Design a protein around this nucleic acid. Structure first.
Ligand code: DZ4
Ligand code: MG
Length: 577
DNA sequence: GCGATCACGT
DNA sequence: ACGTGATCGCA
């Protein structure tokens, strides 16, 4: 029983309400709002969008911070309303973020999955209403209106039990002071978008398509035959059958053609180096040139990513359409793709600030390892210092290969450390990789104590927590399968580190957003990628940002070691180095 | 649509 | 390890 309203009435504008602003298109940027539902003390309402959104009283209510709304995934609605020039304020409860904080492993992606966490099943999953894939379609108004009102009624009913459990978990402030404020900041970042120099991308695409046409022909000559180089199946026939190259590794369904395997194969035939060259070129051309060009809005030449705030098990943000968190940086030929990301206005510049080794600094603090804390208090090169201890040599005796192996141990130490992964990344034996680990724990006994203690805490409590009380349940920590249990143990060690770094970055974003407004700067956040914050700002604001941004980031939280921030700026994302 | 494979950045 | 994405090849 609900009201299919033809007009906005005063009772729909109570100062507390569950609100549903339904955007069915997966990418909500400039997307239709197919319907609105309001549940409050006075009843349940369905409002047609081309009525409420043209009603001054409803729009005023949407934008009044004092009128509190409970929603699911408020950022989706916030952004769709931004594209209509409408401001959404007063969202005091986001059931999506609440369910994500209560248990990220649930993969709660719609109201029904979250309600099922609390034995509430009077709401259908979105996929049952809209179908999936080709069959996906908005249903007739009666069916649509019933779904939206059931979702709003579930949100209405679910706020208290979710807030109660968040409070029992000591996560009430995590939701209200971190994730929900961050949702608004992310909505502004997505809406602003990042300007793309498409002519430069097009220029790069033409060039890659040229080098590809060359390497391709060369491969057809070394193979004495034509074939689809991009088919791992076909390529395996040319390599491990026609050319008789050794089979060093075998995927689950045949021969592996990983760059890992091919590297070891290069000595046997000149084709291998070209196939490797062809694959990097092909990866750039198809994923980063053509892929980026597909998602650039032709009206504004901006990409408007979507930050997924309730996806990872660590609390890190994820990004889609495009995923800007893997634009090439390692290789120079692929690093130049960042030259296409420019300021959205003339005489503006890109400013980029990144935490320096925040994960290892977080580890130092959490493990209270004297050796690790002292290394950062002296602002040492951590990889070089790690090599000095592991190999018991002075700084002058550290060779480039020793530092490379110390760096791999550090990369592993923060991601669990397994032996097979270290041995794999270092192309060494497990016993040798095991020897590296034990030398490391000899040098960093507090890290070893932390790794043992956090595993035991994961087993006793059933979860691990981050600095700001994000938790991750680890049910497989007791499993009797060595592999399933090993992964759970490594997530026990890694999650407090990665998740705490994620907490710090999110808090810095909130602190930076407040400071920029305090200082009345025009600078604005565009992207959070990994441990970096990217802003654009007028060139006249660069000197102030050079002091402001690192200070806010370095003060986001107080650890037992300093937080270091490297920052650069330039006319492009590339040049902000 | 869907599994398998590959690869990119943390 | 976190993921996003693209290509291919079979239903
Ligand atoms: N554990 C982690 N988890 C997620 N992202 C990480 C990370 N560690 C680094 N990133 C990012 C953060 C860093 O800003 C970025 C680059 O640092 P690196 O090359 O990975 N290792 P470093 O800088 O300490 O030693 P060198 O002097 O040889 O460069 O990788
Ligand atoms: Mg670093």
């Amino acid at each position: 029983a609900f009201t299919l309203a033809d007009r906005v009435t005063e009772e729909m504008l109570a100062d507390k309400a569950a609100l549903v602003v339904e955007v069915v298109e997966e990418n909500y940027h400039d997307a239709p709002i197919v319907g609105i539902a309001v549940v409050n003390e006075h009843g349940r309402f369905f409002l047609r969008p081309e009525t409420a959104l043209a009603d001054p009283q409803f729009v005023a209510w949407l934008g009044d911070e004092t009128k509190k709304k409970s929603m699911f995934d408020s950022k989706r609605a916030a952004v769709a309303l931004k594209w209509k020039g409408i401001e959404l304020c007063g969202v005091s409860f986001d059931l999506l973020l609440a369910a994500y904080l209560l248990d990220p492993a649930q993969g709660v992606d719609d109201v029904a999955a979250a309600a099922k966490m609390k034995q509430y099943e009077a709401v259908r999953p979105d996929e049952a209403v809209y179908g999936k894939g080709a069959k996906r379609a908005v249903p007739d108004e009666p069916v649509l209106a019933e779904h939206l009102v059931r979702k709003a009624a579930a949100i209405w009913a679910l706020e208290r039990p979710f807030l109660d459990e968040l409070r029992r978990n000591e996560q009430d402030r995590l939701l209200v002071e971190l994730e929900q404020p961050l949702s608004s900041i992310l909505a502004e970042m997505e809406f602003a978008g990042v300007k793309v120099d498409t002519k430069r991308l097009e220029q790069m695409g033409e060039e890659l398509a040229e080098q590809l046409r060359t390497v391709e022909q060369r491969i057809y000559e070394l193979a004495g035959q034509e074939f689809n180089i991009n088919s791992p199946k076909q390529l395996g026939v040319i390599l491990f059958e026609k050319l008789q190259l050794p089979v060093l590794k075998k995927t689950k369904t045949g021969y592996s053609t990983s760059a890992d395997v091919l590297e070891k194969l290069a000595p046997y035939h000149e084709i291998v180096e070209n196939i490797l060259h062809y694959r990097q070129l092909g990866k750039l051309q198809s994923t980063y040139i053509e892929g980026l060009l597909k998602v650039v809005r032709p009206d504004t030449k901006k990409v408007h990513t979507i930050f997924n705030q309730a996806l990872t098990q660590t609390g890190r943000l994820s990004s889609t359409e495009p995923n800007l968190q893997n634009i090439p940086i390692r290789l120079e030929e692929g690093r130049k793709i960042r030259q296409a990301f420019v300021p959205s206005e003339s005489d503006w510049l890109i400013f980029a600030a990144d935490y320096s080794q925040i994960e290892l600094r977080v580890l130092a603090h959490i493990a209270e390892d004297d050796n690790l804390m002292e290394a950062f208090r002296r602002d040492l090169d951590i990889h070089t210092k790690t090599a000095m201890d592991i190999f018991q040599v002075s700084e002058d005796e550290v060779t480039p290969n020793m530092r490379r192996q110390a760096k791999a141990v550090n990369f592993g130490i923060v991601y669990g450390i397994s032996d097979y992964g270290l041995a794999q990344n270092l192309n060494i034996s497990r016993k040798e990789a095991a020897e590296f680990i034990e030398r490391y724990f000899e040098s960093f006994p507090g890290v070893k104590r932390y790794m043992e203690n956090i595993v035991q805490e994961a087993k006793q409590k059933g979860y691990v927590t981050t600095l700001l009380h994000r938790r991750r349940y680890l049910p497989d920590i007791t499993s009797r399968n060595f592999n399933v249990r090993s992964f759970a143990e490594r997530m026990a060690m890694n999650t407090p580190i990665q998740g705490s770094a994620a907490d710090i970055i999110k808090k810095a974003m909130i602190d930076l957003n407040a400071r920029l407004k305090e200082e009345r700067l025009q600078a604005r956040l565009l992207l959070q990628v990994h441990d970096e914050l990217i802003l654009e700002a007028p060139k006249e604001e660069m000197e102030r940002l050079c002091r402001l941004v690192p200070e806010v980031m370095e003060q986001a939280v107080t650890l037992r070691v300093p937080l270091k921030v490297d920052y650069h700026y330039g006319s492009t994302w590339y040049d902000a180095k």
